[PDB]
């Protein structure tokens, strides 16, 4: 398992999925091969988003070791291509250059190379699969014998997360530092297609390191590593596939069944007090199929002194290329404390100050208010027009939805609550403590709403309540109980 | 095969000009106690941070003549970059201050003149592989 | 019409945050005997060579505690510019580390983080304009 994979020295392949389980083990894993190494060599960890590169330094702590922690694009630019570009073709070429993203697409390696030695600025190419600074950096090293010997004399490995996104000269960088210059390499990446690319992605790169690679340790991650065991047992039982994972445990405590005799509120009341088995200092989250269930438990809370907010699932909130950036986009509209830069981070590369200062004009268009359906789809073409992204139809409708009511402003809030109430739809993605669900939404038997069930149970992190409200949800689980003779699963109240 | 190459001391007290050959083990001794014990305060100001700090006095230049500049420079070999652990230490800092065609040696300079008004001379610390264009240490 | 607006102490030995006005001539006092000469220091740190270059020990951290950064900031007026001699004689040095936006302000700040394995937290200065983006002090 995970011991395994921290142990091992060498170069390590690791597959990651269901999110967040890649992010906790990289950071451990830097942070306890710093703690073994003691030499001056230092670690370097790229990730394609500015979020993600500081979302690791602060769970690091100290860099003293000179350890280089930032965007893909800022570490072949400041590491490799402006200290040894004048070594590499000759004092006629600038080590003050400054690279746009946007501007000054070419069509040859030699048109760019012009560019970058007259017009004095680093443009990318024009064709999204070819990338330009790393075909240079790889060009760099091989003409420079001084950037050979820096690279090997400052990092003796190198941390990749989100490996299915490198295209190919990019890909070409890293197996050149693994290949001629030995330098470890710990590679994190999601072997399934997936939603979300890098405009130039190519996943036959990764896969063909899984499937041919010799060098490389090939891992694998648990989908539900974060959640208890007990929640994992009872998750997984639904799911063909996923029954054969979880093993058995003697005693089980965490997954918590009660029928609903008594009214809702009251069910709250005796968990949180009769049985102690909730705590309403931590959060509590409630788990409903469609938005009218959860306003009328919302409802009826209100008239016990239960306090709650409840966060609806958004038109942006569906599996879709650009959802997870049209989301940031609605956040730095909605709340004025949510920095610009805050949303430069998660697009991909390093912008300069100049270039966020012209994408910053065009979303400043959507501040003003009451300007109409028309004018924020131009604003949302102009915008992604300058990231070479095109938009989905319904991806465009599902923005501008969000931008006129007030209705969804607080599932793109900043601020965050300790008691909520969630659709199974509104957090697919993000995680909760603790989770109350009902059996009598999801149909077990022909399996229509399992995956919506799996979901749903995988949301909890310590402690999962179940109500058993159908007679055929708690059949489904004594009948397969007794297929694989499991006599306890569920903990009865 | 030894990283320290000759360290160069130049109007720097009683150093007029004065070139010493060095290995990474050195042992100086002879009757002028005065040069020995400068000797080696000539090479805490190039590389101890606490006595650098202090700058240069009227003293500390040579025949007390503050015109003369004060130039201490060392000179390193990295040949031995393949198999010395130590000399990839220093090329994880100097970064892009060497150049492939002197890739072998590197310099490591420390250059003071002297203002009348400031009645004081700081201490400037230069590196880089070729000593005609050496760079101000970061 | 002075060019010594105030002075802002963050995190510096018993200064948890302390912000006092100024002018051209000032006068300290009171009970504290510790409060008044850390005062005076707080102000060689920003300004006095002699006193910088020595840095930041463990025991000049508020509480003793170096994850807290100290901040010592100095807030200008040169609003008077066009009949003070002293104002273009700051003028002259600053250079363009000034905006023409905000001409009438100038800070000057001085930065301390520690670091656990140096054992020793250096001094950095900072001026500029604007106080969200000052710049080292070359």
């Given at each position: 398992?995970?011991?395994?994979?921290?142990?091992?020295g060498?170069?390590?392949?690791?597959?990651?999925?269901?999110?967040?389980?890649?992010?906790?083990?990289?950071?451990?894993?830097?942070?306890?091969?710093?703690?073994?190494?003691?030499?001056?060599y230092?670690?370097?960890?790229?990730?394609?988003?500015?979020?993600?590169?500081?979302?690791?330094?602060?769970?690091?702590?100290?860099?003293?070791?000179?350890?280089?922690?930032?965007?893909?694009?800022?570490?072949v630019?400041?590491?490799?291509?402006?200290?040894?570009?004048?070594?590499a073709?000759?004092?006629?070429?600038?080590?003050?250059?400054?690279?746009?993203?946007?501007?000054?697409?070419?069509?040859?390696?030699?048109?760019?190379?012009?560019?970058?030695?007259?017009?004095?600025?680093?443009?990318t190419y024009?064709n999204?699969?070819?990338?330009?600074?790393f075909?240079?950096?790889?060009?760099?090293?091989?003409?420079?014998?001084?950037?050979?010997?820096?690279?090997?004399?400052?990092?003796?490995?190198?941390?990749?997360?989100?490996?299915?996104?490198?295209?190919?000269?990019?890909?070409?960088l890293?197996?050149?530092?693994?290949?001629?210059?030995?330098?470890?390499?710990?590679?994190?990446?999601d072997?399934?297609?997936?939603?979300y690319?890098?405009?130039?992605?190519?996943?036959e790169?990764?896969?063909?390191?899984?499937?041919?690679?010799?060098?490389?340790?090939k891992?694998?991650?648990?989908?539900?590593?974060?959640?208890?065991q007990?929640?994992?047992?009872?998750?997984?039982?639904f799911?063909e596939?996923?029954?054969?994972?979880?093993?058995?445990k003697?005693?089980?405590?965490?997954?918590?069944s009660?029928?609903?005799d008594?009214?809702?509120?009251?069910?709250?009341?005796?968990?949180?007090?009769?049985?102690?088995?909730?705590?309403?200092?931590?959060?509590?989250?409630?788990?409903?199929?469609?938005?009218?269930?959860?306003?009328?438990?919302?409802?009826?809370?209100?008239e016990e002194?239960?306090?709650?907010?409840?966060?609806?699932?958004?038109?942006?909130?569906?599996?879709?290329?650009?959802?997870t950036?049209?989301?940031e986009?609605?956040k730095?509209?909605?709340?004025?404390?949510?920095?610009?830069?805050?949303?430069?981070?998660?697009?991909?590369?390093?912008?300069?100050?100049?270039?966020?200062?012209?994408?910053?004009?065009?979303?400043?268009?959507?501040?003003?208010?009451?300007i109409?359906?028309?004018?924020?789809n131009?604003?949302?073409?102009?915008?992604?027009?300058?990231?070479?992204?095109?938009?989905?139809t319904?991806?465009?409708?599902?923005?501008?939805?969000?931008?006129?009511?007030?209705?969804?402003?607080?599932?793109?809030?900043?601020?965050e609550?300790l008691?909520?109430?969630?659709?199974?739809?509104?957090?697919?993605?993000?995680?909760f403590?603790?989770?109350?669900?009902?059996?009598?939404?999801?149909?077990?038997?022909?399996?229509?709403?399992?995956?919506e069930?799996?979901?749903?149970?995988?949301?909890?992190?310590?402690?999962?309540i179940?109500?058993?409200?159908?007679?055929?949800?708690?059949?489904?689980?004594?009948?397969?109980?007794?297929?694989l003779?499991?006599?306890?699963?569920?903990?009865?109240? | 095969s030894?990283?320290?190459?000759?360290?160069?001391?130049?109007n720097?007290?009683?150093?007029?000009?004065?070139?010493?050959?060095?290995?990474?083990?050195?042992?100086?001794?002879?009757?002028?106690?005065?040069?020995?014990?400068?000797?080696?305060?000539?090479?805490?100001?190039?590389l101890?941070k606490?006595?650098?700090k202090?700058?240069?006095?009227?003293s500390?230049?040579?025949?007390?003549?503050?015109?003369?500049?004060?130039?201490?420079?060392?000179?390193?070999?990295?040949?031995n970059?393949?198999?010395?652990?130590?000399?990839?230490?220093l090329?994880?800092?100097?970064?892009?201050?060497?150049?492939?065609?002197?890739?072998?040696?590197?310099?490591?300079?420390?250059?003071?003149?002297?203002?009348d008004?400031?009645?004081?001379?700081?201490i400037?610390?230069?590196?880089?592989?070729?000593?005609?264009?050496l760079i101000?240490?970061?």
């Amino acid at each position: 398992s995970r011991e395994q994979i921290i142990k091992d020295g060498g170069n390590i392949l690791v597959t990651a999925g269901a999110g967040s389980g890649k992010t906790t083990i990289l950071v451990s894993k830097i942070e306890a091969d710093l703690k073994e190494n003691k030499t001056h060599y230092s670690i370097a960890a790229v990730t394609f988003t500015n979020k993600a590169a500081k979302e690791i330094e602060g769970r690091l702590g100290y860099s003293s070791r000179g350890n280089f922690i930032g965007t893909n694009d800022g570490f072949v630019e400041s590491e490799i291509i402006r200290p040894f570009i004048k070594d590499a073709f000759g004092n006629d070429y600038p080590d003050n250059f400054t690279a746009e993203y946007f501007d000054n697409q070419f069509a040859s390696y030699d048109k760019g190379l012009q560019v970058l030695k007259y017009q004095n600025i680093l443009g990318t190419y024009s064709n999204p699969k070819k990338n330009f600074k790393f075909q240079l950096a790889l060009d760099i090293l091989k003409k420079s014998l001084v950037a050979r010997q820096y690279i090997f004399s400052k990092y003796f490995k190198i941390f990749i997360d989100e490996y299915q996104d490198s295209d190919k000269d990019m890909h070409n960088l890293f197996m050149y530092l693994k290949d001629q210059l030995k330098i470890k390499l710990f590679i994190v990446g999601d072997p399934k297609q997936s939603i979300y690319i890098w405009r130039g992605a190519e996943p036959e790169n990764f896969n063909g390191l899984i499937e041919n690679s010799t060098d490389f340790n090939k891992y694998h991650l648990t989908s539900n590593f974060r959640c208890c065991q007990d929640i994992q047992n009872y998750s997984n039982l639904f799911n063909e596939e996923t029954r054969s994972l979880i093993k058995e445990k003697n005693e089980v405590q965490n997954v918590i069944s009660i029928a609903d005799d008594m009214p809702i509120s009251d069910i709250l009341l005796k968990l949180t007090e009769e049985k102690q088995v909730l705590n309403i200092e931590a959060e509590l989250v409630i788990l409903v199929r469609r938005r009218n269930q959860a306003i009328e438990i919302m409802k009826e809370l209100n008239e016990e002194g239960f306090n709650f907010i409840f966060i609806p699932q958004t038109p942006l909130d569906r599996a879709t290329p650009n959802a997870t950036l049209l989301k940031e986009v609605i956040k730095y509209v909605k709340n004025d404390r949510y920095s610009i830069y805050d949303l430069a981070a998660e697009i991909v590369g390093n912008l300069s100050s100049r270039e966020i200062k012209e994408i910053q004009k065009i979303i400043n268009e959507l501040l003003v208010p009451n300007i109409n359906q028309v004018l924020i789809n131009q604003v949302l073409i102009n915008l992604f027009a300058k990231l070479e992204i095109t938009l989905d139809t319904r991806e465009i409708t599902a923005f501008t939805e969000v931008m006129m009511t007030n209705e969804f402003d607080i599932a793109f809030d900043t601020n965050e609550y300790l008691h909520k109430i969630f659709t199974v739809h509104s957090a697919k993605g993000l995680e909760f403590n603790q989770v109350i669900i009902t059996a009598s939404d999801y149909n077990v038997h022909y399996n229509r709403d399992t995956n919506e069930h799996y979901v749903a149970t995988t949301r909890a992190k310590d402690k999962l309540i179940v109500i058993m409200d159908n007679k055929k949800y708690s059949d489904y689980i004594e009948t397969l109980m007794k297929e694989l003779k499991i006599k306890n699963i569920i903990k009865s109240i | 095969s030894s990283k320290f190459s000759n360290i160069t001391i130049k109007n720097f007290r009683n150093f007029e000009k004065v070139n010493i050959n060095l290995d990474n083990k050195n042992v100086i001794f002879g009757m002028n106690d005065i040069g020995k014990t400068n000797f080696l305060y000539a090479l805490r100001f190039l590389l101890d941070k606490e006595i650098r700090k202090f700058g240069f006095n009227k003293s500390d230049y040579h025949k007390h003549d503050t015109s003369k500049k004060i130039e201490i420079i060392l000179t390193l070999d990295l040949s031995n970059y393949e198999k010395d652990e130590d000399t990839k230490k220093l090329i994880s800092v100097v970064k892009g201050a060497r150049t492939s065609a002197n890739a072998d040696v590197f310099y490591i300079a420390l250059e003071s003149k002297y203002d009348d008004k400031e009645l004081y001379g700081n201490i400037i610390l230069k590196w880089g592989s070729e000593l005609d264009n050496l760079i101000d240490i970061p």
